[PDB]
């Protein structure tokens, strides 16, 4: 409800696109007031938050009167407004097209697929709901196919997903792949090219930045096990039920 | 010369087709028959390994994803600013819609074609429970489109037609073409469609929508091609991702 003097970012580091924007702002030293909005508790569906963003999704950027959603949109906005190093989002027509191509494919094949293990293992059981085994198997196969395409189409024999340098594409991809990794799905094993890529991206980001970005997600399974997670609000419950029923 | 590989039965294919035609961008149009499975053939997999439409080929440079294609074409051919405004916040609004679209529209609004035509074509019924869940999901997404994106503004991302309106319209056309009259009872959405279609022109709209608008009749009359085994495989995978 209350604001800081400038740029506010409403986020929860349990969320993949929140972590992507967090990392981008931190790495570029973009001065940003972090406002934590607790997803599990349901604070993104609170009256106060819906007043800011009627969609009630994270991350949300507030720049004065200007309120903006969608990590890709937020990332591009900040990169321009703050004139970040070119490699992140290259001016070059074709190099930029490669970043947009990845982002488009990501929205389709990664987003909404790689997050599912959190629902299976933590969030569903948290409200008494099990994800059927057949769906879990389907999701695992879907993840493996997507990693194969990630390796073959995008990475190739190149250092990063959209060319010779780290772009927004790499940031988005990593934070999504981190979700199953944090729950004990070791996605990089048996995938040497992908493993090398991760090492490359994380080396660039810095160990300390990666640590603080990934801290929450790396502890969530254990916190769920010790039953220290918040009880979802009725609004969060409703949204959770809908999300779970969207698992194919 | 540029080539566009496309099939007008497909929503993102139509969006790119419309943008190019409205802007007079000279493209070699190359029809790739999706139902037959030409997108999964060796010759096309040799061009786009992902075997997905639309695909744009610019000499050596091969590009997929309608959003990426649209942006690329807009900069390459320097189309009128309004399609993709250079203004920081106007542009962010376009990206914001496109991202939300990929999550809430793309993959949801196409489902009735699978229910009514494509599934039955290969002996697969979509369970009623999924059909009803999909209908509810469409209605919820339409509500966000009206309340959050349009509001009382003329278009989805501001005062003028942008890439956002093109993608939205072509996705919404899919259920419409299959008998879901979803602009009924939703004045803001109906007015928006009227605005977008008036800007594009009746002939371009007619040309873009002709194929999808005749697909139910083709299914009823049983004149649709038999899918290749590769198409069949992909169809089963797509049907199984309906929740």
Swiss-Prot record, chain A:
Alphabetized PROSITE patterns for the sequence: GST_CTER (PS50405), GST_NTER (PS50404)
Subcellular location: Cytoplasm, Cytosol; Nucleus
Gene: GSTT2
Domain GST C-terminal residues, every copy: 92-228
GO molecular function: glutathione transferase activity
Tagged with keyword Cytoplasm: yes
Main location: cytoplasm
Name assigned to this protein: Glutathione S-transferase theta-2
Enzyme class: transferase
Enzyme Commission number(s) of this protein: 2.5.1.18
Curated annotation (Swiss-Prot), chain B:
Family to which the UniProt record says this protein belongs: Belongs to the GST superfamily. Theta family.
Free-text tissue specificity from the UniProt record: Expressed at low levels in liver. In lung, expressed at low levels in ciliated bronchiolar cells, alveolar macrophages and alveolar type II cells.
Native source organism of the sequence: Homo sapiens (Human)
Protein name, per record: Glutathione S-transferase theta-2
Residues reported in the UniProt entry to bind glutathione: 39-40, 52-53, 65-66, 103-106
Chain ranges of the GST C-terminal domain: 87-223
CDD domains for the chain: GST_C_Theta, GST_N_Theta
PANTHER family linked: GLUTATHIONE S-TRANSFERASE THETA-2-RELATED, PTHR43917
Keywords linked to the UniProt accession: Cytoplasm, Nucleus, Transferase
Location within or outside the cell: Cytoplasm, Cytosol; Nucleus
Gene3D superfamilies cross-referenced by the UniProt entry: 1.20.1050.10, Glutaredoxin
Gene Ontology biological process terms from the UniProt entry: glutathione metabolic process
Reactions that this protein is recorded to catalyse: RX + glutathione = an S-substituted glutathione + a halide anion + H(+)
Transmembrane segments: none
GO cellular component: cytoplasm; cytosol; extracellular exosome; nucleus
């Amino acid at each position: 409800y209350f604001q800081s003097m400038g740029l506010e970012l409403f986020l929860d580091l349990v969320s993949q696109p929140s972590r992507a924007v967090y990392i981008f702002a931190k790495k570029n030293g973009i001065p940003l007031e972090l406002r934590t909005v607790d997803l599990v508790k349901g604070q993104h569906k609170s009256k106060e938050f819906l007043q800011i963003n009627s969609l009630g999704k994270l991350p949300t950027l507030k720049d004065g009167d200007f309120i903006l959603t969608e990590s890709s949109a937020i990332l591009i906005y900040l990169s321009c407004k703050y004139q970040t190093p070119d490699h992140w989002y290259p001016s070059d027509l074709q190099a930029r097209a490669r970043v947009h191509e990845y982002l488009g494919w990501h929205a389709d094949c990664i987003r909404g697929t790689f997050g599912i293990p959190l629902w299976v293992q933590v969030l569903g059981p948290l409200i008494g709901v099990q994800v059927p085994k057949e769906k879990v198997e389907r999701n695992r196969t879907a993840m493996d196919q997507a990693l194969q395409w990630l390796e073959d189409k995008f990475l190739g024999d190149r250092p990063f997903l959209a060319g010779q340098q780290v772009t927004l594409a790499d940031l988005m991809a990593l934070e999504e792949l981190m979700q199953p990794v944090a729950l004990g799905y070791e996605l990089f094993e048996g995938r040497p090219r992908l493993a090398a890529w991760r090492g490359r991206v994380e080396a660039f980001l810095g160990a300390e930045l990666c640590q603080e970005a990934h801290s929450i997600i790396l502890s969530i399974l254990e916190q769920a096990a010790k039953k220290t997670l918040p009880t979802p609000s009725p609004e969060a419950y409703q949204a959770m039920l809908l999300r779970i029923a969207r698992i194919p």
